[PDB]
Design a protein around this ligand. Structure first.
Ligand SMILES: *N1=[C][C]=C2[C]=C(O[C])C(C3=[C]C4=C([C]=[C]3)N=C([N]C(=O)[N][C][C]=O)S4)=[C]C2=[C]1
Length: 267
């Protein structure tokens, strides 16, 4: 709390990041260290929600989770200051990358990193609820960090019920969430599967061409996305395992990370 607090004049604001895709996030400079930082500023979302986002993040410490640096929560406008990522989101990164550099073993390394962060959150009784390539960020040397700004506290055996009339990213959303607004860590496992598919396709859109209003119906009848071009069968089986209808049948992130660790060590 107090140790995280810093004065607003320690930061110089530059231009907005991502053209508003991340919301009110600006590139900033922490003058004292001459360090480029990311500053979330607050219309927009509610104040207490904003403040809780900051409160949760200072409990979070993992090499593959975006790190909180400080906060300005004494006088408006409120600031949340996090580390700045060199390249931006994983989706645009994969679409624009050199695939000879970002090859099969790099993809595996990226999945291992993301699954490592989710294994951590799983242990710390958190859920993400928006795991996707657009919410992963990339630093140099194929470093990947999961954005952890919308984390919810949830015990491992419990269920989060989203508010009435909530809008979901349908093509990343688990069937129990689409139908009953229920979220759990197994729901993040589903989203991870789709995130894997994004990575294996270098940023293709999920269920391409398929009408959003029929996605749930397709899932009911056990339709699943095809094995991507050049995707290892073992990796695709992990994807299919993530997309099991019964959430309790889906793998934990501990098992997912272990499987990816093995593959990354054997290539
Ligand atoms: N508050 C709430 C939500 C946030 C989401 C989010 O991204 C998912 C960020 C964020 C965005 C970016 C960061 C760091 C954190 N670094 C970037 N680098 C970049 O774009 N490089 C290319 C050009 O400079 S983008 C913050 C959020 C805060």
């Amino acid at each position: 709390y107090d140790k995280w607090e810093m004065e607003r004049t320690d930061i110089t604001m530059k231009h907005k990041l991502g053209g508003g895709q991340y919301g009110e996030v600006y590139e900033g400079v922490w003058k004292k260290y001459s360090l480029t930082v990311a500053v979330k500023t607050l219309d927009t979302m509610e104040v207490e929600e904003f403040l809780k986002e900051a409160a949760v993040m200072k409990e979070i410490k993992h090499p593959n989770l975006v790190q909180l640096l400080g906060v300005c929560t004494r006088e408006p406008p409120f600031y949340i200051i996090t580390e700045f990522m060199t390249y931006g989101n994983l989706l645009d990164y994969l679409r624009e990358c050199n695939r000879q550099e970002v090859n099969a073993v790099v993809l595996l390394y990226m999945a291992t990193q993301i699954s490592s962060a989710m294994e951590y959150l799983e242990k710390k009784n958190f859920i993400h609820r928006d795991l996707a390539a657009r919410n992963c960020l990339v630093g140099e040397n194929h470093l990947v960090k999961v954005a952890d700004f919308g984390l919810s506290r949830l015990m491992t055996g419990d269920t989060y019920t989203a508010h009435a009339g909530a809008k979901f990213p349908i093509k990343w959303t688990a069937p129990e969430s689409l139908a009953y607004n229920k979220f759990s860590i197994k729901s993040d496992v589903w989203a991870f599967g789709v995130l894997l598919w994004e990575i294996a396709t270098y940023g293709m859109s999920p269920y391409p061409g398929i009408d959003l209003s029929q996605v749930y119906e397709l899932l009911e009848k056990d339709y699943r996305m095809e094995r991507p071009e050049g995707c290892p069968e073992k990796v695709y089986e992990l994807m299919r395992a993530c997309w099991q209808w019964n959430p309790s049948d889906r793998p934990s992130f501990a098992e997912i990370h272990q499987a990816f660790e093995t593959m990354f060590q054997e290539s």
